[PDB]
Design a protein. Structure first.
Lengths: 355, 355, 355, 355, 355
């Protein structure tokens, strides 16, 4: 429901000499907050007892807003403190979850960097797939039912698994059932897709509304448990084990793509951005991620996407190979975001970047 | 054919107050170009429609020379524009390929950073092997024919494969034949070598003719498709698949060697450089790479080498652990190259570094 | 035996205007030395013929103390040169080994950064396990004998191996016996523990006595041979091989943890530090490492620890994502150590950091 | 005559990927050019034999356009080279003079940073005085004729002189006549004004059209010959001399104002800018200078002004006390100008800053 | 009256995770505030309508506390806002004046950087002279009455004047009387001292309680009106004028002393600091200034001193020749102060630096 005009009129009651930057103490905040500081902003970190330390030892947050549980960040109490601090909020991962995405779309009355509406088109696999499909991006083939399985597939609902046949599907579905990890409910709605075999590049872009431009900021590959520990076990020993792959994100590892694939990489960000404009105006605002896999035909296949800032950006908080190129600075995505805010304020174009 | 005296006399007609740096928009250019800019140079990027974007959004090239296809970079038209811009060319990967290595050795009349002649000793496995062998470097054992196969071997001609027996060789050779990936022609000339099992360090060195010194700039490990995606599949599931490993370079990942192996690492660069002096004078000039594997006996075995700048340097465009040590700067290899140029110009020693 | 008062009285005869920083040319020294230089210190590198080059080409050491073999660093001759240079020694890895840990605890009369006593609690698996256990840290389950083996286990004594049964244990123990890699002596004392399956984070902390605070400096994952080369071989091909995993450290790869796990990460450093205070006063001083594995339940399990600086810090000599956050500098662990020294000298608190 | 639309249509035929920055090798160019380089621009310096060295040894210009005499910079030949290089021209001091201000206002068909029209309102004392007067700025009292002289006055036409009476006026007018320094022509048009006695602050501002804001960049005091050498002679000795003060600008000396006078300083820039908008639209664009004198009542009296960049900015090419405050950078005025250009290009607002 | 224990107990109720730095928008604040920001602090500027602009355009203050008149900064309302923001106050010049020094010594209940008590020993010429005299510093000779005048003297009470005889004294005293500038009241209390003829060095020191050390930060020479404008008038013309010298501080100019005089310069800071310890414990804390004159015998004579930060530090907000030497940074005095605060907080030694 949340209107833009409704948000622009909250921002107007804002002391424009004292715009702070706020976000939740988790996910990507360290460099969101550090990046604000580096751009001259004072930073507000929503945190809680037990989860505050890293924001305290990294000296990255000027003001803390402590909650009892991160769940409370939907409360009017917290929204008020945030408005009283003239904070623009930088959403992420974790913020959407603890706040709840409905609360974010119509209950969270705090100005927010980026296109609010577009946060749903990422929460929903149908919307996400629509966008990537309509944008004209390579996605893994979808499979309506386990009977369609005609190659290796991955099956999504931690409870992930791999299958090369309909038979293998239920064999495994059953396994994860008789072990409590999967309920017949999840198994019914199971999303089955082509298992793309290749190299992982989670590619972090920044669309600048001010500059009307898609920028490449960086790239990481996921570091997942247990899978990445599983495959570090020799095949002989893996076969002697009764173990299921899990794919819990635990970290990220820096990587750079082959330079001749940047034209492809940029086109992918352009296309996505150009279609998101039509489907969810104003479209992709600020940071977004294409989580892709490079098959052996040097084709990047997008198996997931983020419409906010993605966790992999943590791999370059001190800047990386790509973010450096612009101005030879240790530029993080957090800071890149802070700059857009800064510059928008300075050109009186805050309406191009908040919602 | 291209003479040095012939090149020095092209460079003389050059406005020495306006030396630019040129290269082709691909492979390693981003930091070749950015590194020039950082050293005060104005940069020329040879590019083409559709492949130009990343050099435009990274603001890394002052002048573009657009071609219809990168193939045209052999044309006299392009050579002239380059000479008229007082450009020293920085070769790479991609440049050799689109230009063609014959054209580079006797048809490309533009001054070029590094030892021109030595670019062949990298194109040819016989020369390369000679050099590494004569330099005194550990290389994987070669195998004349599939009958000699007495361990695990890798077989080179994308169409790579692994074999642990003569039988397995043809079994697989056939596989890649009946699937169009390999023609009996490639299979006949198949290069078979010891499969070295260990950790990948692509080690980037810089020989400075001015300083007469081998420098360590950085290290990456290859990120290859589909192999690195293949091995991320659990053994159980891999066995249920009918899939062949491919080894297409798609990216690079930063790594540092165990410090006690740097003496070995430096000796390897010294030896290579000292033998390349005798075999292909003036020898290794500027950037070169030993693509090695560290076996469990902490011995680095070189399975490949580059005599120009290697793609892995992209892993440290914002500088890395090793390039930092010299002056605490975010030093890339591109910039290290620009500096040599700069300094050579300033000491009037351009003849120690171009050809 | 070495007393603190005994060490403080060596340091007093020191020219406090000329404190140098010394360490051994290996392990982590490059950034220990570079970090000293960056903090204004003059640096002393103990080296030897053939192992000196990298410290010479990296221009990181002001004075070399050449030995015939690194073994000699216990000699009174070397201790004297070091005292005459007013050097505080920064221990590491390699230093403990060549010097010998007994020699370090009671024969090495040179001031040393960090808690001397605590270097043993890392050399001994019983002490180490006590500390991690008492600190309240997750460790892999221990197994008294091969008969207790009831899951996958790893077995430690290069000569490492994996087992999923008592039968498999001896099958493999025998293998490594009949191949000379393992003697019945090692096999008897074999340490058997739960094979933790997950993502490797070697987490580098710095306890500051001055600031009384645990800082997070960085993280790497080990790059080991042959294992990490072994698992890069396709399962089908691995099965056709007769090859044993080895786990020789050859390098390190940068990684960042999922941000929501930093509270856990910091608590682990706090707990360790708080227990080391009681067990080995003054406790953990300066750099220490928890070498952990993140299981799929996002629990970090510590399978090893260093009480001095760990080799992985080499992954961020030009600084990393975490070290950056403090002051936006390319901060290495070597430099972080130099700073503590510097600052201790300046506040006249050298007794909080040497021993 | 020169139209804006006329200029915007020259700029359109410009390759927007290759905008260079050009100016004349003199006056303030060193930091105009260096500041461009630092912002990523390639720089064009118009120079001539004998006057080129400092731009060559400072490595500040990528391309030189040599003229026979700086006078030629009006020629169509030079305008074409400049248009072909996609150069935006940055006017100064010296450029106006050698080019001639008429040629600049209607004959110089090269895009130019800042408000073209406003360059006249600085060439003419009547316009200048109007502006400062209408802006509401303190100026020294004007004196119609030598008979009005009722205090100390300075008299302007090198040929300057000071008078405290009508009698003294002609006494001195005669002196400079019978010595050839002044012709009866100059003496007739002599401008006579109140001699303001106080401290010199030449205050360099930057109006940003993008940010719609007046910024304080720096301050210098003039270093003039012979006056500043004259007054360094003891009074006793000066009286024994027959010497006339001259006021030839030879250099500049850095100074900072008393902080409590910055509100006054900023108001002066605001007022000037706000009136220049009405009188000469778009008004003051970019760099301008109020050359003032602080009387003992802490009132700043403007005795001169520049509507382009003023020579004093040379006092802070490595940045100064005020330019630092914004981002802690060594920010020069040249660079501040380059940034505006850069940013205007990036927001597609080149029409707010060229003419 | 204000107690330390009384202040330490205000600071305890402070959120130690959110210490801000506050001061008054004037005098030296720009670099006090900027220096805080650079050290990670969030900054509070007390300002008022009309005087706020420079702190707004320099983006140097995160939070403004607007007053109706700077006088109000004594109000409990303002003290509360400041305590609620966890602000340590950095006194200066302007702050003492608007707040009133009595209010500062016993009515201003906000923690304050430096030794509170010592602010009086600077307000009073008797205390100041005692300190400089007892410290063992060269001061100009004092003159009890105009009859003692036996050389050139300067006479202090804007209303300053110079005299070389008793006769000249009253001649001039009368002049400034019959012109309203001096009342018989001021003339009675007139302070008469030796006119020291030499070069002005206002020398800015920083005593660090943490480091127990006097540091040299920088040096400026005063730029005063009308005197410095007066002496720029030729002697002949000055004699034709009826003008009185005034000495209103309007600005500052950077200068460096002859290096061989630094031993003297440092001794002067040591002595002052060592005597201030005895006379006003804890003594000189943080920034202080010796405003001296170098006579021709290379002896520095202190004619004034500041016990807080002096306005001349504005001459090096981007750092200067001396502040650079420590760490090669553009270190201002504001930042040097912020660092002491930072570091004191980090070593839990806030009691060594506040009062
Ligand atoms: N189509 C696919 N082919 C191969 N691996 C995949 C595919 N989709 C996902 N994965 C692996 O499983 C992990 C979880 O996938 P997914 O849940 O889609 O990403 P996320 O949970 O981060 O949105 C991915 O990081 C990737 O490594
Ligand atoms: N002797 C070998 N042992 C194991 N792996 C190898 C060997 N040679 C090559 N490889 C793997 O195959 C990839 C392709 O090898 P190669 O074609 O020699 O390198 P490039 O194509 O980059 O010159 C390498 O990056 C390496 O990972
Ligand atoms: N409990 C475990 N589970 C899985 N892998 C392990 C375990 N312990 C060690 N390893 C692997 O074997 C390597 C050697 O382990 P260890 O010898 O304990 O470390 P280090 O030799 O560096 O002290 C580790 O780097 C890790 O990759
Ligand atoms: N009204 C004045 N009172 C005192 N000095 C002045 C006055 N006007 C000019 N001067 C001095 O003479 C010099 C030349 O003045 P002017 O010619 O107006 O400046 P410019 O030539 O730089 O435009 C100035 O730099 C200043 O030092
Ligand atoms: N003893 C002296 N000899 C010569 N000049 C002096 C002397 N004392 C002060 N002055 C000049 O007069 C100015 C005002 O002096 P004073 O009022 O003592 O300093 P402040 O007002 O800054 O405390 C000084 O900046 C200096 O230039
Ligand atoms: N790559 C990362 O480091 C990363 N960390 C967290 N996420 C995502 O962030 C969301 C919330 O993060 P968390 O559980 O740490 O609060 C999760 O749905 C997870 O998919 C990540 N992935 C993408 O944002
Ligand atoms: N490591 C890398 O990122 C990398 N990228 C490209 N190359 C080599 O560069 C040559 C040309 O590169 P490309 O196909 O991107 O134009 C290829 O033969 C490839 O082996 C690479 N390897 C070595 O130069
Ligand atoms: N991770 C690393 O790069 C690393 N390099 C060396 N070490 C340890 O350092 C010790 C001595 O090192 P070296 O063998 O290079 O002299 C060894 O016991 C080894 O376990 C390492 N691991 C931990 O310190
Ligand atoms: N302050 C300076 O260094 C300075 N240098 C040159 N100017 C002005 O510049 C004009 C041209 O300079 P020049 O003679 O160096 O080419 C002159 O009218 C002179 O008044 C200066 N003053 C203002 O622009
Ligand atoms: N040197 C300077 O720039 C300077 N500016 C101001 N002061 C002193 O500061 C006090 C208050 O300053 P103000 O009048 O700008 O608010 C005055 O007594 C003046 O002597 C200065 N001198 C010493 O602090
Ligand atoms: Cl992102
Ligand atoms: Cl290379
Ligand atoms: Cl460590
Ligand atoms: Cl200006
Ligand atoms: Cl001071």
């Amino acid at each position: 429901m949340i209107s833009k005009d409704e948000i622009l009129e909250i921002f107007d009651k804002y002391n424009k000499d004292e715009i702070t930057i706020a976000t939740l103490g988790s996910h990507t905040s360290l460099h969101i907050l550090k990046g604000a500081k580096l751009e001259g902003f004072s930073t507000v970190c929503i945190t809680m007892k037990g989860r505050d330390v890293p924001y305290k030892r990294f000296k990255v947050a000027d003001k803390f807003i402590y909650v009892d549980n991160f769940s409370d960040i939907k409360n009017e109490e917290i929204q008020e403190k945030l408005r009283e601090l003239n904070s623009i909020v930088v959403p992420h991962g974790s913020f959407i979850a603890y706040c709840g995405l409905d609360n974010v779309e119509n209950s969270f009355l705090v100005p927010m960097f980026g296109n609010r509406r577009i946060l749903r088109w990422e929460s929903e696999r149908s919307l996400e797939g629509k966008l990537l499909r309509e944008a004209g991006l390579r996605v893994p083939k979808k499979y309506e039912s386990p009977e369609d399985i005609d190659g290796t597939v991955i099956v999504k609902f931690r409870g992930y698994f791999i299958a090369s046949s309909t038979e293998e599907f239920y064999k495994k579905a059953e396994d994860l059932k008789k072990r409590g990890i999967l309920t017949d409910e999840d198994i019914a709605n199971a999303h089955i897709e082509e298992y793309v075999v290749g190299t992982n590049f989670c590619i972090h872009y920044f669309y600048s509304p001010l500059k009307d431009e898609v920028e490449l900021l960086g790239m990481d590959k996921r570091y997942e448990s247990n899978i990445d520990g599983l495959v570090r076990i020799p095949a002989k020993d893996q076969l002697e084990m009764n173990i299921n792959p899990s794919y819990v994100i635990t970290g990220n590892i820096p990587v750079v793509i082959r330079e001749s694939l940047l034209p492809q990489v940029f086109e992918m960000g352009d296309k996505l951005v150009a279609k998101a404009k039509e489907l969810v105006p104003p479209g992709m605002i600020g940071p977004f991620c294409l989580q892709s896999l490079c098959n052996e035909n040097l084709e990047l296949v997008v198996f997931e996407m983020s419409a906010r800032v993605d966790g992999g950006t943590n791999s370059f908080m001190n800047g990386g190979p790509y973010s450096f190129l612009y101005n030879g600075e240790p530029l993080s995505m957090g800071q890149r975001i802070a700059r857009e805010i800064k510059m928008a304020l300075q050109l009186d174009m805050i309406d191009k970047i908040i919602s």
